[PDB]
């Protein structure tokens, strides 16, 4: 499965997350940005490497980084 | 190698998948390995390795044969 | 009237109940091949498509090989004999270690209710998982298919060696 | 022309030399 | 007839523009689908039914041009190895194994029987291509019987495969222009776009522009 | 002689003879059954009759354009192959009429699809069986000028043997 | 779908045919290999340079032995501007009789040698098909010491 | 013109952003950087240039052939 | 047996069986389990 | 004509799932719908909604959230998507703790947090041979 890390440097703008096409991303508390929010990664097994979660951020070099790795069934995105 | 990239030989991957998982006669033989394409690096791998040998063998084969059929 | 429906009432299934896939003469027709006969042990099964598939294979190799004959000779047939019982040992060093690679089990259609009643809880994909239910998806049942194809082979391609000289000298 | 006796033993050698590339393959592990 | 840099100038450069025109047609079909097509107003019609069953179609085409290519590219490679070995009465040729075109060979004798038979209004065949005599203008020949024989047969079945194979690539880039296996969601990310990212192994070029491309490829090959 | 399918306008339910009055259902899935495989084997019949005639591209022509007469030509193994064909398909036939939910002359079991049949279907189904009466009594008639006159369908139209 | 890049768990875990075609690939990426230290590291490399040397000495051999075998070096030594040297025969079931006939040096169908090693080894002082045996087999032995 | 269509066609975006990277670097050192940022090909466009080139070469040297061909003879 | 058999002997002894030995041989090392 | 009476009124594609989804996961959307509104298959081609509830099966987690998506443009919201295993084993994927993940919801902890931005990335020759 691909390898997903969050930065502190998150803004809390919330678009990476409403990108994600398999649900790994989400939104959790935090207190190191205006928006009380940074994003997370609970579920990497789910992780295609699409990398559309790191086109929407915003931030200069991205919060959000994809390093792609081991290849499983779901992060081949077979649907046989 | 070169010119086509991946994607477009996933989905056609897809489409021989379902034709031999959906045939009869076929489907007692399954493979044990999911069939896919192959990948960007090892696409750009494998069209330069067709490439550089086809460059050589067509290269070495003219030079050797012109030297030999006009000097003899 | 519509001749295409979901199959077995599944819309959901990457598979279709078409004229083809659905129709009687597909059932009757695949029920009477040797590969899904009912009352056939997978020895007969791999006699039987054995023998049809070199009878068939001398075909191409004798008419067409590197030694062919306008009129008949012994030596056009027995080259066409001996490529297409090479090609039927090669098949079936292909069926044997795919068979070889593919199943571990000795008994099927019983370990599944097995783990599906006495739990599973081991390594899996023995006692659990198992995909079909065939005599034919076993060690001991491929390796009896793979004895048969390549003995009826052999004697398919003789048979149609035989049946070409005779009709290739008496007619 | 060189014999058969010459093209045996070469050959001889040579498998000699089969067997120790195998037993260096093999101790280079699977 | 008898200026022959006419003739050939006119005939390549009108099937030029009409493979160019194809490959356009194709690409505004995948651009329709993509942009136009509304799933609401054309239920379990002819577009969505072919949408359903786009596998079918996709793979019966890739396993004929897969057919159509071993065959028509092996024999020419078939007869170019064993004529550099030295066997010339194994070849696909007229004087060795041969492949008549029968059925075009038939159809060649029907039209220049025609006149007095089936048009019997006619005084001689529409061309004589199909057969009749030779027709010379100043001691050029104007038109004259194109025989069929065996190397017809062969780049026949060429033009077949390359037109298939381009098909293949056109087709493959409609039906697939709005969801597939790997993007469900093909169609939110518009008709011309790059990829969906290295993911899934590598999504490149699953565009339906990026069929277009390669069947511009193609479409080039054959012509 | 019953709702099944077949029945027309110009005789709605012909049994003159009344030979499904007293015959039960088994019975008539037979006469069914018999009657589309002579419609089926007629239209074959009358199709090839007329194709032989004005065309024969096979045997290097030869196999001369007369029916009834390239039948002591063909080289009588090509009769036995056809004849292992038709044996081959009426086995596979055979076979099929066991199926579940099985009608008489449906071999394509359209009975899988084809709940609560429509009016189309019923008249698709009338048409093929018109089609094959009309074919057996044309191929009846093609047999038997044949065998009085000794000139084939378009040799007799042709000369005016009528 | 295991047990085939015994070096990389990551990929005997893959279910597609991508883990064989990157077990070809990643084999001599000695560095990325799984539980992996600088020792095995140079001692594998060590190791992997004297069966490359051994590769190397038997080819060299090879060549000298099928000069020795199918040449024609001792006819060469005689007329180096006429003769021209032949690398090794051709025995293939492919050939027509033409092919036989115009590939035909000699005794046999061969290739004619555009290594050089005629010249070479006739400046280096060879003169005889005896010589080159005898160099044959002491490459040989060479590659089973490097073995 | 052919065989310029093989350096869009094999090649990718990322080397030619990097290498505009160091031409841009050079003119700022001399004060020539242009206001408006260059930016190598879109890929979709990287794309579009390789298939037309390659239609344009090949078309083009068959046109050249066919027509010196059949007019000299 | 003169050594101008050896080639007969040994071309289709190499080119054709060790390819099917080394096929049987990496396609069961390659298609192995744990 | 259907095998369940929930199931959208779909006439079935060959897009569908595979053997895959029998022998190593499926997936299964489910949402109810006040209109028997007309959608497209993440797969193939329409299907008609049913007017209350609606479950369907694919071979891909990708598959139901972009059939999801396209629910949202319908304002259905109350989709929840499922993993099923050989046997049935459910586990309910998309809607992990009720809200949706671009929504913060308390109870979440961060998975994958670096304390430092991308320049702060160790020295690859640093992380040799562990
Ligand atoms: C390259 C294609 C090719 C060629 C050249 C042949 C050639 C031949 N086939 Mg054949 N065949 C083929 C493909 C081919 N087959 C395929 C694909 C099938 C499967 C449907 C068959 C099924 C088949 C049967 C069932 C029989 C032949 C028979 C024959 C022989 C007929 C002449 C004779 O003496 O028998 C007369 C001849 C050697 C016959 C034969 O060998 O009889 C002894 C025979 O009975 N063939
Ligand atoms: C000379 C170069 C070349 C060749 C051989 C091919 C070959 C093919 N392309 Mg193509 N292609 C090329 C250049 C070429 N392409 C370029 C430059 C591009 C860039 C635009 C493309 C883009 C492209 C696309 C986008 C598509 C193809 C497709 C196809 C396939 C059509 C089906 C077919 O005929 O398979 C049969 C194979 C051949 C004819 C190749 C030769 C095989 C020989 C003659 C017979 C078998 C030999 C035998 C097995 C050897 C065994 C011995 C060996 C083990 C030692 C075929 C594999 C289509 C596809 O996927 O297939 C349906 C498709 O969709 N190609
Ligand atoms: C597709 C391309 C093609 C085709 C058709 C052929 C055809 C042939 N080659 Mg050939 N060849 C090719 C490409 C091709 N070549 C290429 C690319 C190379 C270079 C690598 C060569 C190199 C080569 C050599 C070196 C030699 C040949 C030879 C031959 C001949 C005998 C081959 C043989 O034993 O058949 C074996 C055939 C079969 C086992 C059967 C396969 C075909 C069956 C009939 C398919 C049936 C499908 C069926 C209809 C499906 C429906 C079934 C139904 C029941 C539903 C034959 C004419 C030999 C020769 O001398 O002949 C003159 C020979 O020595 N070839
Ligand atoms: C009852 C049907 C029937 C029978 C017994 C014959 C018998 C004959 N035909 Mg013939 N023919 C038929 C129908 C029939 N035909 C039809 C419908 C056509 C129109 C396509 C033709 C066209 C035709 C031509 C063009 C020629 C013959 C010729 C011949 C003679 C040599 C055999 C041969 O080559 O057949 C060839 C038959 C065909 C090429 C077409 C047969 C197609 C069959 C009937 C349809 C499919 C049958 C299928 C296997 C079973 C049905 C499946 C399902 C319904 C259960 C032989 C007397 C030859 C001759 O010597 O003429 C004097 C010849 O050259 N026939
Ligand atoms: C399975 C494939 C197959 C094969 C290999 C053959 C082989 C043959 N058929 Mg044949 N045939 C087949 C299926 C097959 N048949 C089927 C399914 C039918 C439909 C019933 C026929 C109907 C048929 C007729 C009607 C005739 C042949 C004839 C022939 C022979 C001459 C063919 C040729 O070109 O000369 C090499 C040859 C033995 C001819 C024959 O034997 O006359 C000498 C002939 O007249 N066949
Ligand atoms: C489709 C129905 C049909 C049609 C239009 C014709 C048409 C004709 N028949 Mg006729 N015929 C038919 C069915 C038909 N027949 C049937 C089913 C039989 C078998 C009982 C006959 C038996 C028959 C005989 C015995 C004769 C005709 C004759 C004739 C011709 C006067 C004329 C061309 C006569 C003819 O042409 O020969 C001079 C003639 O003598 N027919
Ligand atoms: C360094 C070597 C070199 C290179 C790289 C090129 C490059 C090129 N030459 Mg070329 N040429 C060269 C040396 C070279 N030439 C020399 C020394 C001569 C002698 C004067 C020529 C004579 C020459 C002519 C006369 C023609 C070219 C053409 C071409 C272009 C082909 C473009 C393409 O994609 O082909 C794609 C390749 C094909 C479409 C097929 C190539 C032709 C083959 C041999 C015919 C075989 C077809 C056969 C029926 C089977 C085909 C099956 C398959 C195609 C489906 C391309 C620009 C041609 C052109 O404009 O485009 C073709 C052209 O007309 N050149
Ligand atoms: C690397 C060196 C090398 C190479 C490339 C060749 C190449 C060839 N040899 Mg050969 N040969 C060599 C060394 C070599 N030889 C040596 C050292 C000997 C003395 C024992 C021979 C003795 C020999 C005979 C007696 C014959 C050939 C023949 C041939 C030809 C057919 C192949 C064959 O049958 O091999 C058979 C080769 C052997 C039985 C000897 C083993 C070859 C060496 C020792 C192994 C080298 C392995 C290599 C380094 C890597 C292996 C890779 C592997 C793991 C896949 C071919 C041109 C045949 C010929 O001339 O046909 C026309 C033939 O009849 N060879
Ligand atoms: C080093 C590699 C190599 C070698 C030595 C051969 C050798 C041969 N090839 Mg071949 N081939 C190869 C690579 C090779 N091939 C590759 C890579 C390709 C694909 C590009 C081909 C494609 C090819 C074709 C298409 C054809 C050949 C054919 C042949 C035969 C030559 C024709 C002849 O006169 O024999 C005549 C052959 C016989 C009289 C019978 C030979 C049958 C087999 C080979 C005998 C094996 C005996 C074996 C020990 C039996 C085991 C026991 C068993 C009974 C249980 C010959 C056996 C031709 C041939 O004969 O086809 C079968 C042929 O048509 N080859
Ligand atoms: C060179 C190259 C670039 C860089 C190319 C650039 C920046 C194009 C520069 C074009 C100049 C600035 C204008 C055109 C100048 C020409 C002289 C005008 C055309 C000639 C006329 C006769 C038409 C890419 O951006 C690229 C992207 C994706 C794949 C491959 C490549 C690629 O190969
Ligand atoms: S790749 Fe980027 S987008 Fe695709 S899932 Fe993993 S994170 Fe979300
Ligand atoms: S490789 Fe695939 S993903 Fe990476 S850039 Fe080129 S197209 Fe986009």
Not at chain 1, 4 to 31: F, N, S
Not at chain 3, 43 to 57: D, K, M, P, W
Not at chain 10, 109 to 123: F, H, L, Q, T, Y
Request: aromatic residues 12%.
């Amino acid at each position: 499965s691909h390898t997903v890390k969050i930065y502190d440097t998150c803004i809390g703008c919330t678009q990476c997350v409403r990108a994600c096409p398999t649900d790994v991303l989400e939104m959790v508390p935090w207190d190191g940005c205006k928006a009380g929010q940074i994003a997370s990664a609970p579920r990497t097994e789910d992780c295609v490497g699409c990398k559309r979660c790191e086109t929407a951020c915003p931030t200069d070099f991205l919060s959000v980084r994809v390093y792609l790795g081991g290849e499983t069934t779901r992060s081949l995105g077979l649907a046989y | 190698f070169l010119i086509s990239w991946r994607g477009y030989w996933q989905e056609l991957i897809e489409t021989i998948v379902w034709a031999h998982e959906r045939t009869p006669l076929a489907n007692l033989v399954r493979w044990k390995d999911k069939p896919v394409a192959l990948s960007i690096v090892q696409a750009r791998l494998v069209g330069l390795a067709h490439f550089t040998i086809g460059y050589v063998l067509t290269y070495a084969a003219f030079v050797i044969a012109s030297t030999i059929g006009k000097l003899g | 009237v519509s001749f295409i429906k979901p199959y077995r009432q599944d819309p959901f299934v990457g598979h279709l109940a078409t004229p083809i896939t659905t129709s009687a003469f597909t059932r009757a027709y695949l029920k009477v091949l040797p590969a899904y006969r009912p009352g056939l042990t997978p020895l007969s099964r791999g006699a039987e498509i054995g023998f049809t598939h070199g009878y068939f294979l001398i075909g191409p190799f004798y008419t067409y090989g590197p030694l062919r004959s306008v009129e008949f000779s012994l030596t056009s047939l027995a080259a066409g004999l001996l490529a297409a019982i090479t090609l039927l040992l090669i098949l079936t060093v292909g069926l044997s270690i795919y068979g070889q690679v593919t199943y571990d089990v000795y008994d099927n259609a019983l370990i599944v209710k097995l783990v599906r009643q006495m739990v599973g809880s081991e390594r899996t994909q023995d006692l659990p998982q198992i995909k079909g239910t065939s005599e034919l998806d076993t060690v001991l049942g491929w390796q009896k298919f793979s004895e048969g194809f390549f003995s009826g082979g052999l004697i398919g391609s003789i048979v149609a060696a035989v049946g070409i000289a005779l009709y290739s000298t008496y007619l | 022309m060189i014999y058969d006796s010459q093209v045996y033993i070469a050959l001889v050698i040579a498998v000699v030399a089969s067997v120790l590339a195998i037993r260096l393959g093999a101790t280079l592990y699977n | 007839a008898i200026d022959y840099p006419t003739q050939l100038s006119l005939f390549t450069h009108h099937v030029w523009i009409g493979g160019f025109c194809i490959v356009g047609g194709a690409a505004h079909g995948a651009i329709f689908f993509v942009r136009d097509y509304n799933a609401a107003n054309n239920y379990n019609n002819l577009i969505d039914r072919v949408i359903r069953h786009r596998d079918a179609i996709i793979s019966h085409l890739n396993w004929v041009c897969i057919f159509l290519g071993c065959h028509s590219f092996g024999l020419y490679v078939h007869n170019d190895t064993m004529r550099a070995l030295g066997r010339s009465q194994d070849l696909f040729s007229d004087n060795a194994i041969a492949l008549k075109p029968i059925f075009a060979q038939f159809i060649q004798n029907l039209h220049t029987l025609a006149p007095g038979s089936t048009a019997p209004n006619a005084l001689t065949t529409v061309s004589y291509a199909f057969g009749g005599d030779v027709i010379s203008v100043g001691s050029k020949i104007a038109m004259m019987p194109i025989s069929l024989g065996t190397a017809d047969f062969l780049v026949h079945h060429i033009h077949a495969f390359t037109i298939h194979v381009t098909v293949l690539i056109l087709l493959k880039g409609v039906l697939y222009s709005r969801n597939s296996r790997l993007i469900p969601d093909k169609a939110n990310l518009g008709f011309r776009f790059p990829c969906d990212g290295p993911g899934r192994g590598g999504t490149c070029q699953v565009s339906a522009w990026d069929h277009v491309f390669l069947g511009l490829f193609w479409m080039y090959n054959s012509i | 002689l019953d709702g099944m399918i077949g029945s027309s306008a110009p005789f709605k339910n012909f049994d003159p003879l009344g030979f499904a009055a007293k015959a039960d259902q088994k019975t008539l899935n037979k006469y069914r059954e018999s009657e589309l495989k002579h419609g089926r084997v007629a239209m074959l019949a009358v199709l090839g009759w007329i194709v032989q005639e004005f065309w024969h591209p096979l045997y290097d022509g030869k196999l001369s354009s007369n029916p009834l007469k390239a039948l002591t030509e063909v080289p009588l193994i090509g009769w036995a192959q056809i004849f292992v064909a038709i044996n081959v398909i009426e086995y596979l036939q055979n076979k099929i009429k066991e199926l579940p939910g099985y009608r008489p002359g449906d071999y394509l079991g359209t009975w899988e699809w084809v709940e609560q049949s429509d009016e189309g279907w019923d008249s698709y189904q009338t048409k093929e069986l018109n089609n094959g009466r009309l074919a057996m009594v044309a191929i009846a008639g093609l047999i038997v000028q044949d065998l009085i006159t000794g000139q084939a369908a378009l040799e007799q139209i042709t000369a005016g043997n009528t | 779908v295991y047990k085939f890049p015994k070096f990389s768990k990551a990929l005997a875990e893959d279910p597609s045919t991508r883990r064989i075609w990157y077990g070809i690939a990643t084999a001599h990426d000695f560095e990325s290999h799984d539980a992996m230290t600088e020792s095995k590291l140079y001692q594998k490399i060590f190791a992997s340079h004297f069966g490359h040397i051994a590769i190397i000495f038997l080819w060299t051999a090879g060549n000298l032995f099928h000069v020795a075998w199918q040449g024609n070096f001792e006819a060469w030594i005689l007329n180096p501007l006429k003769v021209r040297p032949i690398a090794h025969a051709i025995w293939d079931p492919h050939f027509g009789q033409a092919a036989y006939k115009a590939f035909l040096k000699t005794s046999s169908p061969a290739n004619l040698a555009l290594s050089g090693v005629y010249e070479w080894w006739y400046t280096i002082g060879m003169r005889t098909n005896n010589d080159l045996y005898q160099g044959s087999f002491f490459l040989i032995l060479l590659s089973s010491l490097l073995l | 013109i052919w065989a310029f269509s093989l350096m869009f066609l094999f090649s990718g975006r990322g080397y030619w952003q990097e290498l505009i990277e160091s031409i841009v670097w050079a003119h700022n050192k001399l004060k020539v950087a242009p206001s408006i940022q260059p930016r190598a090909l879109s890929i979709t466009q990287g794309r579009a240039v390789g298939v037309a080139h390659y239609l344009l070469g090949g078309i083009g040297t068959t046109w050249a052939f066919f027509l010196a061909r059949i007019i000299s003879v | 047996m003169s050594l101008d058999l050896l080639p007969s002997f040994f071309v289709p002894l190499v080119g054709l069986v060790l390819p099917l030995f080394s096929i049987i041989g990496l396609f069961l090392y390659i298609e192995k389990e744990n | 004509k259907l095998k369940q009476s929930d199931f959208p009124k779909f006439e079935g594609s060959t897009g569908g799932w595979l053997s895959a989804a029998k022998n190593e996961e499926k997936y299964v959307i489910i949402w109810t719908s006040k209109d028997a509104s007309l959608f497209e298959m993440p797969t193939g081609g329409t299907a008609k909604m049913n007017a209350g509830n609606n479950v369907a099966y694919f071979a891909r987690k990708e598959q139901c959230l972009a059939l999801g998506s396209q629910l949202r443009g319908f304002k259905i919201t109350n989709y929840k998507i499922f993993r099923i295993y050989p046997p049935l084993d459910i586990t309910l994927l998309h809607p992990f703790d009720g809200v949706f993940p671009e929504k913060v919801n308390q109870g979440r902890s961060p998975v994958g947090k670096r304390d430092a931005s991308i320049g702060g990335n160790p020295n690859p020759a640093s992380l040799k041979f562990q």
